Design a protein around this ligand. Structure first.
Ligand SMILES: O[C@H]1[C@H](O)[C@@H](O)[C@H](O)[C@@H](O)[C@H]1O
Ligand SMILES: [Zn+2]
Ligand SMILES: [Zn+2]
Ligand SMILES: [Zn+2]
Ligand SMILES: [Zn+2]
Length: 296
């Protein structure tokens, strides 16, 4: 029993999508620097804040991909950071929130990108990868298989997207060379072609066109089941009120959301945005989710 309207329940939108559809094919909203929502100091915010609400709000609003940046501590734990700044959020904090969300909504899956954001603290008994694997990944909540991961196998679990080196355990999407500030194409789990638009520090106009260009490619290659498209709409801070991630998101989110609304495509990729909220219309994450209508 699956209807297109079930995509409108932002907490269970993946439910109507078939088990055999690769996550790569699905158009999924994601949040950039997901754990920066606790930053209070205006100076820290203008430079590194990318979200206003916590993880559950993000999830309840359709986001299923999270950009987690961590640092290994002397306590053999991983805490979230933005460069040298501790975000007052921990990795366990995110996983627990994800666990709760998945328990409440078992039809969904959570894709967690994990990147080492800052140098390890002195005193850790191991490495970033060995500590994450031993104290976190062992948890049954993490999918342990790879390949072109299908939705059915991911439901109720966290799917890892590695952005760190040294992994020694199978599961999720393998780490791959990720060039700096570019739109690039490469491969991951042997059979998945990946294209990423991550020009995080280009001028505003270059960024908008970059997002649209990669989305245009995605919309016209909608039947490529083993191709993964990740499109970051986020743009790094200029350090001022008129060029902070917030100011940029205020215009980019509605702009790109309108592109999808007008075009009404069957695929737009994994769209990772800053500031998921309901302040700007059309809502990007909603339009991204609605782009899965043809899969039902
Ligand atoms: O500041 C940037 C931005 O967060 C990009 O999205 C990420 O891919 C880069 O690694 C980071 O340096
Ligand atoms: Zn929290
Ligand atoms: Zn300590
Ligand atoms: Zn392809
Ligand atoms: Zn809301």
């Amino acid at each position: 029993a699956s209807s297109v309207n079930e995509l409108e329940n932002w907490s269970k939108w993946m439910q109507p999508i078939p088990d055999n559809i690769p996550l790569a094919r699905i158009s999924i909203p994601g949040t950039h620097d997901s754990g920066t929502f606790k930053l209070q100091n205006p100076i820290k915010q203008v430079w590194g804040m990318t979200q206003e609400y916590d993880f559950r709000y993000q999830m309840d609003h359709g986001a299923r991909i999270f950009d987690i940046r961590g640092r290994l501590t002397d306590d053999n734990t991983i805490v979230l950071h933005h460069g040298p700044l501790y975000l007052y959020v921990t990795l366990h904090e995110f996983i627990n929130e994800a666990k709760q969300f998945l328990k409440d909504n078992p039809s969904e899956t959570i894709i967690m990108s994990l990147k080492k954001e800052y140098e390890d603290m002195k005193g850790a008994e191991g490495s970033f990868s060995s500590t994450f694997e031993k104290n976190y990944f062992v948890d049954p909540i993490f999918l342990k298989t790879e390949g072109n991961i299908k939705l059915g196998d991911a439901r109720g679990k966290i799917v890892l997207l590695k952005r760190y080196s040294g992994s020694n355990e199978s599961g999720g999407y393998n780490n791959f060379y990720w060039p700096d500030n570019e739109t690039f194409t490469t491969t991951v789990n042997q059979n998945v072609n990946v294209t990423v638009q991550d020009k995080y520090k280009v001028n505003y106009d270059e960024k908008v066109k970059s997002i649209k260009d990669t989305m245009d490619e995605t919309m016209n290659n909608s039947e490529d089941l083993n191709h993964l498209y990740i499109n970051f709409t986020s743009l790094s801070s200029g350090g001022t009120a008129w060029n902070s991630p917030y100011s940029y998101a205020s215009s980019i989110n509605p702009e790109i959301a309108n592109d999808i609304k007008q075009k009404n495509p069957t695929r737009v990729g994994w769209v990772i945005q800053d500031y998921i909220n309901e302040k700007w219309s059309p809502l990007l994450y909603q339009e991204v989710i609605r782009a899965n209508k043809s899969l039902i």
